[PDB]
Amino acid sequence: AEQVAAERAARKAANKEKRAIILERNAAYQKEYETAERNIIQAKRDAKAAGSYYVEAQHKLVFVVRIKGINKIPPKPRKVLQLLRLTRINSGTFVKVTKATLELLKLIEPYVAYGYPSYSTIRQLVYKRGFGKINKQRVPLSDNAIIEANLGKYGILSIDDLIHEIITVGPHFKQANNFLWPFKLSNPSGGWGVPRKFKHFIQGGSFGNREEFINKLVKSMN
Amino acid sequence: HRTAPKSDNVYLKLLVKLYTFLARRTDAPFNKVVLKALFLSKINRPPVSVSRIARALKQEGAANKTVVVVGTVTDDARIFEFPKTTVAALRFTAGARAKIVKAGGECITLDQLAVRAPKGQNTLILRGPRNSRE
Amino acid sequence: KVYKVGDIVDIKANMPHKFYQGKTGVVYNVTKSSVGVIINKMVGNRYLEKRLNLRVEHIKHSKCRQEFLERVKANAAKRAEAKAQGVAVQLKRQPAQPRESRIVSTEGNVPQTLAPVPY
RNA sequence: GGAAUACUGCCAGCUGGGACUGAGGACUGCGACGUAAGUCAAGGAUGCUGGCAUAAUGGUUAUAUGCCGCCCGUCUUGAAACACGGACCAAGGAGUCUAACGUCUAUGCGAGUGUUUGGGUGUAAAACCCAUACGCGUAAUGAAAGUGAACGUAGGUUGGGGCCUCGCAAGAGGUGCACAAUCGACCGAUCCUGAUGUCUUCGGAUGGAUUUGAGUAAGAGCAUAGCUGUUGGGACCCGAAAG
RNA sequence: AAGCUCGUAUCAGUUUUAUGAGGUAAAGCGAAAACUUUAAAUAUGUAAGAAGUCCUUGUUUGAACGUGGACAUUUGAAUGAAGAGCUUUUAGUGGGCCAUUUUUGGUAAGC
RNA sequence: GCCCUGAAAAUGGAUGGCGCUCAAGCGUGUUACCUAUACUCUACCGUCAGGGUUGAUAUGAUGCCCUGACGAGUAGGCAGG
């Protein structure tokens, strides 16, 4: 049994380069995020100081959680919850926003809470409840080899790469997204508010679109 | 789809052992077919005549190809001349065995085939006529 | 308007008798005074065919397969160009997308406030 | 005019209290902290200390206390309750045997197959051995007389598990089993055509057009055993008026 | 299931696009309400590539029909994904209440 | 908008009961709390699915091992005991 030292030296040298690559990638992503945010703030200020109004871009990505149980659903609402991978209650997925998916989101509205997620909630979801589907089998991520050796043919080779591809809808949103097994949240820790859940969020319930409080919901349901 | 033979031939079970090992650790599409063929029931393994073999040996490029049948090889009387070849099978009946070994050839078993061709090289597999009957 | 066996047509009656009125099928016969269509009906959860016999003037040709052909020819053109040069051409369609950022201007347009009206 | 605070949001900021769990069993992996060997909270709990060694812990059991639970079986798929059976106990008590066909699986031999009506022998209703016959299969079709299966490498085209060749792959090319689709060839039935000729009416050469059949187009069957299906025998068991 | 030929990137109680159908104004505006110029849906059918495109043109130039090569997989919208099709036959079943959503017809009121 | 009348008999009785009047009633707003065989995390049993293992000598190859998702049921079906 030869190859007693050369292999250890070569592997320990090969990992020490991927580490630096990942360091650089993350250090650049951070600058990109903070620059975009500060730019949007300053643009709003410039419109105000010039006597005008600056409108933003419609949100590109929603997060959808299934709220109601599995009984007494008609078939057309029952099929969209399958095409969305929302098979059991308190399960969540991301969804790209287009005119083709918005109608889906409006067809199952009385059974979901959905909205617009932020960097912090995406990051917490992936770091705590992130599980990949590797040939099957809901594998916990827990490592970068797992992500790279199954999602690397699209330039994704770490976990911040995945979070980035999700938060800024890139070219491989579909592949990165179907990589992630649907999220299995728990009930909210502080409760729901709302004596009764099955009214519209506008009208004092839970289902529908809240557009910004999905973060306060999911950070506690997480 | 099958996973273990319904027969009780201990020798057939040894054959399945050997070819499962070969199918697992060789990665050649030959063993994967012969192991599957070693599971069929008797109505699904028609006998392959000794003249269908001669008919197959006339295809251009089949001079020294080893012909493999995974059932029974029966005799034939309507053919007169017979090439010089080597055939591997489960069983040869008396007439077919005599004809082959008299025309100069050789009659071998399946494990010896597996040792003369661990990946089934320069071979040619034959199947019998299924639906000449019901 | 002259129909052949196999073409596609839709039913359109120019009162209270029967209402398919907007389906689409294939001509399986053309007699002198009429034409005959078939229609796959959902019999619970199966598709069983009914053979209807319309008249001449109660049926018109269909344009439900013109856009496919026109788009295939436009794609032939685009791919001829994409072989004539090295070009990313992006033949696929795309679903309608969400808008981007903008800056409206209140120069000749001051926002006029309006409240709801009484009774 | 210059600050402050509130509400909303973020921190890979710090830091106390409580409860449940401790699966795995030599090493291997990804990391971190160190100039350094080494160390660690990093692929699942260890370290220190006390009491007891027995009815103390635990199992069984009787009762008490808190909450829960309408009498079993059957038949009507509901007031779903009605209605019918049940006093108690022991023993008995109901899909079995056969004949004839058919699917499926195992075994033997395989263009064959089948010893056991009978004969020979026997350590005697066992075991062993055997001649001639016979059935099914290897040829079909017409009402019948009757006739009765290769132009060719056993065919032509498309698809096709493998194998072969070139190649690292990726691919590309060759030959292609079973089976499928379509065009043809051969046998019988059917409509014509009608030769070298002959008991003067016999014979049916040759070339043709329809469909047709569980036809041919290098055989796949026979016997035994098991699980089962259908029909007939009293036929899952008891219970009734009759000629 | 008996079982064997086939998981074949093709399928789907879903949305989008093209287009028909409701045509009700409730877009919305008229040549003296008098439109059809045209929405937004409400569930309503069909279609969205390899059995496809071009070159070249022999028969009963446009109609079908034959022919000899070019055509590549971000190969022609979105979401999900491996459980559709023949043969054998083998077991049970073959007739009913409550509610909602349309539609028709109803009288003391039910229906 | 609340409140009274706006008909209804006959063994003694029913917002479930006691009782409740700036409510323990009615309309509404904001919070805190109780609680399912439902949701989350962990262990154990089985079933199904995907991978490894002939390497001798080692104790069983219808075995041994690693990973994952799952678990109602009458007529009826298949399997192990």
Features of this protein?
part of a larger assembly; 3 chains; A: 222 residues; alpha+beta; five-stranded mixed beta sheet; two-stranded antiparallel ribbon; 8 strands; B: 134 residues; alpha/beta; Ribosomal Protein L15, Chain: K, domain 2; two-stranded parallel ribbon; 5 helices; 34% helix; 13% strand; globular; RNA-binding; ribosome; Pre-60s; rpl4; 60S ribosomal protein L7-A; 60S ribosomal protein L18-A
What does this structure look like?
Chain C: Keywords: Cytoplasm, Isopeptide bond, Ribonucleoprotein, Ribosomal protein, Ubl conjugation. Chain C: Belongs to the eukaryotic ribosomal protein eL21 family. Chain C: This is Large ribosomal subunit protein eL21A. Chain C: It is found in: Cytoplasm. This is part of a larger assembly, with chains A (222 residues), B (134 residues) and C (119 residues). Chain A has 222 residues and is an alpha+beta fold. Chain A has one domain (1-222). Chain A has helices at 6-50, 75-83, 101-107, 119-129, 144-151, 159-167, 173-179, 214-221, and strands at 52-55, 61-66, 91-96, 112-115, 131-132, 139-140, 183-184, 208-209. In chain A, the strands form two sheets. Chain A has a five-stranded mixed sheet with strand order 7-3-2-4-8, with no helix packed on it. A two-stranded antiparallel sheet of chain A has the order 5-6. In chain A, α4 packs across α6. The termini of chain A are far apart. Chain B has one domain (1-132): Ribosomal Protein L15, Chain: K, domain 2. Chain B is built from five helices and six strands. In chain B, the strands form two sheets. A four-stranded parallel sheet of chain B has the order 5-3-1-6. Chain B has a two-stranded parallel ribbon with strand order 2-4. In chain B, α1 runs antiparallel to α2. Chain C is flat. Chain C has a five-stranded antiparallel sheet, with no helix packed on it. In chain C, a hairpin with a 3-residue loop joins β2 (24-30) and β3. Chain C is 16% helix and 30% strand. At the A-C interface, β1 of A face β6 of C. β1 (52-55) of chain A pairs antiparallel with β6 of chain C. Chain B binds three RNA strands through residues 4, 6-9, 17, 20-21, 24, 29-30, 33, 40-44, 46-49, 51-52, 54-56, 58-62, 65, 72, 74-79, 93-95, 120-134.
Write the layout of secondary structure elements.
This is part of a larger assembly, with chains A (222 residues), B (134 residues) and C (119 residues).
Chain A: H1 6-50, E1 52-55, E2 61-66, H2 75-83, E3 91-96, H3 101-107, E4 112-115, H4 119-129, E5 131-132, E6 139-140, H5 144-151, H6 159-167, H7 173-179, E7 183-184, E8 208-209, H8 214-221
Parallel strand pairs in A: 4-8
Antiparallel strand pairs in A: 2-3, 2-4, 3-7, 5-6
Helix pairs in contact in A: 4-6
Chain B: H1 10-24, H2 31-37, H3 50-57, E1 66-69, E2 72-73, E3 86-88, E4 91-92, H4 94-102, E5 106-108, H5 110-116, E6 123-126
Chain C: E1 8-11, E2 24-30, E3 34-42, E4 47-55, E5 59-61, H1 66-84, E6 102-105
Antiparallel strand pairs in C: 1-2, 1-5, 2-3, 3-4
Chain B binds 3 RNA strands through residues 4, 6-9, 17, 20-21, 24, 29-30, 33, 40-44, 46-49, 51-52, 54-56, 58-62, 65, 72, 74-79, 93-95, 120-134.
